[PDB]
Design a protein around this ligand. Sequence first.
Ligand code: HEM
Ligand code: HEM
Ligand code: HEM
Ligand code: HEM
Lengths: 141, 141, 146, 146
Amino acid sequence: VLSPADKTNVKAAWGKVGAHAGEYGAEALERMFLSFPTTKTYFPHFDLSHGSAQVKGHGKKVADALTNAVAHVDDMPNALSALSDLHAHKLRVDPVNFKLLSHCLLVTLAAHLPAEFTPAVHASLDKFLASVSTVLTSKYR
Amino acid sequence: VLSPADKTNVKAAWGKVGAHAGEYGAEALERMFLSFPTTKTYFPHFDLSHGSAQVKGHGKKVADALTNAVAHVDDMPNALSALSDLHAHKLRVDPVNFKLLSHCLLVTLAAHLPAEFTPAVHASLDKFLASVSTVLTSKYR
Amino acid sequence: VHLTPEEKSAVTALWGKVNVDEVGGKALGRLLVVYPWTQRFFESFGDLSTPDAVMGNPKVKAHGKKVLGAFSDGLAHLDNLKGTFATLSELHCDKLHVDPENFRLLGNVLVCVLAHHFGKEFTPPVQAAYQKVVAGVANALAHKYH
Amino acid sequence: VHLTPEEKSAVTALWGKVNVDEVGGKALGRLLVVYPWTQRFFESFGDLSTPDAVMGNPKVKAHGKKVLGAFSDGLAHLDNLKGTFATLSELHCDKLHVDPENFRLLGNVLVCVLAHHFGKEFTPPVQAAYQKVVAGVANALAHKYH
Ligand code: HEM
Ligand code: HEM
Ligand code: HEM
Ligand code: HEM
């Protein structure tokens, strides 16, 4: 459960991503694929090479989904139901993988937004990604 | 995130508990303290022996809080804010312990209400206790 | 896993009453129902679309019997779980890539199923004994990740 | 823990640039802020009432230096993490009763602190190498549980 401050923190920090959505999303995915190789198994036949245009386009979708989550932070399940259909119902992604991607997104934000990534903001972003993760791995239809 | 059927399952299952709520709450704590001894470190001031009146009395408090949570399943953060203040702000309970007590509650319910503890109901109660746990371990105001 | 003579006696008495052809299927089926993502590891098992489908799925039951057999084997070798489960660890960790938290979940689902089948007989002290056992099995299975 | 030789060179090059007096403090500090329940193990450290109070707490900073030193001891003997952390494992596990998942969390917070401090230099491959190290350290500290 996010506090009002967590919400202000997430909106401010994630709001800086802007036009870097694809770039930051791709980097987080590449960090995950390299650090935790088992995650590549959810993407068989994907071109997962360094600088891959497919990963860049996928990173953009993930980042845009988070922007959507931010714009509906107080009612996320209803805003992310199609992503829950995909990750929980269809793909059956093990929740551990969301912890791995969330950590890689935090690492990516920490590397690109030094002024924003304060301990308090770091705490809010972790909670936010954990909540997004729970929505995407839950079946609530 | 609970589905509409999960909420129905939880209300139907907890409804059957009724008058035993207190007894089951005490049993879940006893099971937890015996099976996972480290959980006892949160109650140094308690007489934790089998049959302890303190454990019996605390079991009733936990049980009544779950009844309240069930009654407010759509708005738990607001309804459980005082418990969140206690468990997250004051006592700083490590979230692992909530998974242990949740499991002990499921064991207690399976042991007492076999007919009612169907696989679908078990699934719903697990998600419900996980959500209650997240509320109680989050600082959101 | 060290159990007191009292604990070993109670654990053994309870296990002797376990229906070996059914309890394993009930535990595996509940794992698939309660933690749905685990279904991904069993896509060759057929219909796992609803709780009734999972519980009545002959492949779930048959496989559950093997899982139960492994827990039984563990009960007879509590002093050498890491060795006993070495092959299974390599299968689940290196080949299947099952995250180890799922081993802990299956063990706890097995405990819920024992509670479900034995009611009052599954006392708090008996549960405490079983938790040490299933923790031991989960840990041995996860050895390749340690 | 086995790092390629290129991974070990990349890990040690970066570590040689880590401020011994502050990084441990920032990681421990962030653990307390990001995972608030961990504050429970440090009641004697004084004021942990706000993020600022936590990060500026002299005891958090001093204790953070010791944590960082343990990581450095780990990096100097990657082929003996269990022995290197044996005494520490007993202390945290059997004595302080810190749940094991928390070890993984501190390791990840340390990775975030390294990324925050080094920016673009903390490349994905470099992070991959550090992940092997912090997983090894966490597993070694949890040893008295396996
Ligand atoms: C922060 C959490 C995540 C977010 C916001 C997210 C978001 C998305 C979005 C927006 C899509 C594309 C939907 C569409 O095009 O219709 C997608 C697809 C997908 N995601 Fe995620 N995702 C997350 C985590 C994960 C994780 C942890 C995994 C597995 C390790 C995963 C595996 C996949 C797969 C396999 C696809 C489909 C790719 C394809 O075959 O086309 N996702 N995700
Ligand atoms: C399902 C989850 C839980 C519920 C519904 C719950 C509920 C409650 C309630 C209603 C109280 C009494 C509050 C008051 O009188 O102000 C309480 C107190 C307390 N709870 Fe929990 N609790 C849960 C889990 C836990 C866990 C996992 C732990 C730690 C192992 C814990 C430790 C405590 C402690 C130490 C107290 C104070 C007892 C005293 O000194 O009187 N609780 N809880
Ligand atoms: C923790 C206790 C567990 C025990 C004792 C256990 C035991 C076993 C045994 C005895 C086999 C048969 C191996 C063979 O014939 O060579 C097996 C297979 C398998 N197990 Fe487990 N297991 C456990 C947990 C899990 C979990 C948590 C998962 C995943 C969520 C899993 C997934 C599998 C899969 C996918 C197979 C292969 C099934 C097939 O034939 O397609 N197991 N397990
Ligand atoms: C996983 C990485 C960790 C490493 C390398 C580490 C290392 C250390 C070291 C070297 C000491 C000093 C021991 C001495 O005084 O001889 C220590 C003390 C301590 N650690 Fe850790 N630790 C880790 C994680 C944790 C976690 C996750 C917690 C709790 C949430 C924790 C809680 C403590 C406490 C409470 C002390 C004693 C502080 C005192 O003297 O009052 N540690 N640790």
